[PDB]
Symmetry: C2
Subunit: 142 residues, 2 copies
C-alpha cells in the first residue's frame, strides 16, 4: 500500500491541509500529515512516515521568505527523499500573498519542478483537486 | 430542485467556503455562494438566490465583534428568510480565534439556534462534513 506524506506548517494543518488529506482519502489514496513545526524529537519519530511515502507533498508557506523557511523547516523533509528514490516530490506554494518569484527560485535551486500554486480568486477547493489529480494520475493510476 | 445559499465575507470565499460548497455539491446538493461584502447594487441583484434557497447557511466571521458585523453585513441576509418561511437558517461561527460567547449571544438575540463552530485543533474538513451532514439529513433526506 503506497501512501502520500503531506508536510506543512502548523498554521495550515487544520485548514487547507485537512481538506487536501480528506480529498486524497476520498480518492482511495492513503496519506499522513507531518507538521514541520514540531520539536526535532517528535520529528525524528516521524521521519519514517516521510521516508516510506511513495509521494511527498510539501505544502509550503508561500507568503513567507523562503530564506527563513526552507533550511529551517523543509530541508529535513526533502532529505528524506533519498531514502527512497522511488519517491516523488510535489510542492505546493500556498498562501493569499505569495512571494511567488522568490519561491520559484528557491524550488529550482532545490531541484524541484513539480509545483502547484495558490492563484488570485482561484478557489482552494480547485487547488486541492488539482493536487489530487496530479498525485493520482502520476502514481496511483496506470 | 431545492438549493442551499451560503453567505460569507470575502476573506473566506475562496478558502473555507469553497470547500463547503464543493462538499455540498458532492452530496448532490445544489448551492450558490453570496459574498456579503459586495456593493448593495450587486446584492440587490443577488437577493433572489437567498430568498429562493431552501436552506440559508450563514458563514460568519467569528473572530470579529458581532456588533460591527451583523447589522452591517448579515441582517440583510436573514431578512431574506421571511420571503420563504420554508427556509431554514444554519449558522457557522468560523475562525481560529472566535469571540464565541459574543457570537452565541448575538445569534440567540437574532432567534438563531442551529449553530456550527470552529473548534481548537478540530479540522476544517471535519467542520465542513458536520455542516453537510446537518443540511443533508435535515432537508435533503427523508
Ligand atoms: Na480525512
Ligand atoms: Na495546480
Ligand atoms: Na464546487
Ligand atoms: Na459542527
Amino acid at each position: 500500500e503506497e501512501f502520500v506524506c503531506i508536510s506543512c506548517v502548523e498554521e495550515v494543518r487544520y485548514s487547507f491541509v485537512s481538506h487536501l488529506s480528506e480529498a486524497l482519502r476520498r480518492k482511495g489514496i492513503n496519506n499522513v500529515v507531518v507538521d514541520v513545526d514540531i520539536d526535532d524529537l517528535l520529528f525524528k519519530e516521524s521521519q519514517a512516515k516521510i521516508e516510506k511515502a511513495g509521494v511527498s507533498v510539501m505544502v509550503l508557506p508561500g507568503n513567507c521568505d523562503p530564506s527563513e523557511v526552507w533550511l529551517d523547516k523543509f530541508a529535513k523533509v526533502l532529505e528524506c527523499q533519498r531514502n527512497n528514490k522511488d519517491q516523488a516530490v510535489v510542492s505546493v506554494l500556498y498562501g493569499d500573498s505569495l512571494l511567488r518569484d522568490q519561491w520559484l527560485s528557491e524550488l529550482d535551486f532545490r531541484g524541484l519542478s513539480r509545483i502547484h500554486q495558490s492563484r488570485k480568486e482561484c478557489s482552494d477547493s480547485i487547488l486541492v483537486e488539482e493536487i489530487v489529480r496530479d498525485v493520482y494520475e502520476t502514481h496511483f493510476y496506470v
